[PDB]
Amino acid sequence: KWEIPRSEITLERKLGSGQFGEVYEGKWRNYNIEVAVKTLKEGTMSVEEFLQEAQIMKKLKHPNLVQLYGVCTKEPPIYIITEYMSHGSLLDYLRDCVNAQALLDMAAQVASGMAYLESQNFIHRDLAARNCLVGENNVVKVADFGFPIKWTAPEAISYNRFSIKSDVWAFGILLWEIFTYGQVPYPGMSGSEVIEQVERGYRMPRPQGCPEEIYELMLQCWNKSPEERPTFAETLHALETMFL
Ligand SMILES: Cc1ccc(NC(=O)c2ccc(CN3CCN(C)CC3)cc2)cc1Nc1nccc(-c2cccnc2)n1
């Protein structure tokens, strides 16, 4: 049902690479549309486990989550195909320097996609600006491509206790990357310093020009106790109800 015949897809550019496979921009000849194409490097893992990513994705449908288009699974190399986002990663897009209202809009869209995931009983586990994509009209979508200490909540580092609340922690960090135009967090600090300082109560200070109301939401995301962090639903309402 999600099988696409392989001849319909034409590869055009290497986007990124790795150890389980690579990703390309391609063209889908039928729809006259650009696609992203993720490939299985044979023998780096099973075909079955590669396609478990596509299985999850068939259950999810939301304007701020990357849409699966289909798979090519009849022979190697196995493909998972999604929409292509014209402006690439949020992080790269922020790094070209917009208004605080537009930065807010982008944050809301991520929260929106996360809220949907939460509602469907999934966790991300790797939320970060590098993992969100930008299209036209400032549309933002959450993706997962795919340490990393600086995005990972304390209980996750210490007890391997990942949860939707550890995701809320990472969204606080992402909020900070957004409102700094994509700076690397905890500037200068190494990982072990970050783990130690954070444990003792350290939080990044408010970025230059960032609204206090926005900064206050980041602090709520970074509560030391996970049960006291806001839900993603709560988080979206908070963002929509900031004005100016
Ligand atoms: C080609 C592909 C294959 C798979 C995916 N997968 C996902 O984006 C994804 C998102 C959410 C989940 C759900 N979630 C994962 C976390 N776990 C714990 C459970 C639930 C799963 C996969 C995206 C894509 N798209 C993709 N991948 C890399 C780069 C790009 C890309 C780059 C530049 C411009 N446009 C697109 N696009």
Q: What is the DSSP string of 65-121?
A: BPPEEEEE-SSSSPEEEEE--TT-BHHHHHTT---HHHHHHHHHHHHHHHHHHHHTT
CB crowding 172-197: b at 16 or more within 10 Å, else e: bbbbbbbbbbbeebbeebeeeebbee
The amino acid at 174 = L
* Spatial separation of the C-alpha atoms in residues 162 and 124, rounded to whole Å: 9
Please identify every residue annotated as catalytic.
126
- Name the experiment that determined this structure: X-ray
From 11, 144, 232, the mutation candidate for ligand 1 (largest count of ligand atoms within 8 A of CB) is 144
- First-to-last alpha carbon distance for the chain, in angstroms, is 47
* Spatial separation of the C-alpha atoms in residues 42 and 20, rounded to whole Å: 8
* Spatial separation of the C-alpha atoms in residues 177 and 47, rounded to whole Å: 35
Resolution at which this structure was determined, Å: 2.0
Domains of the chain: 1-84 (3.30.200.20), 85-244 (1.10.510.10)
Closest C-alpha to ligand 1, atom 28: 145
Q: Which residues line ligand 1 (CB under 6 A)?
A: 15, 23, 36-38, 53, 56-57, 66, 80, 82, 84-85, 88, 122-125, 133, 143-145
Q: Are strands 33-39 and 132-134 parallel, antiparallel or unpaired?
A: unpaired
Contact status, residue 49 vs residue 69, Cβ threshold 8 Å? no
* Spatial separation of the C-alpha atoms in residues 6 and 72, rounded to whole Å: 6
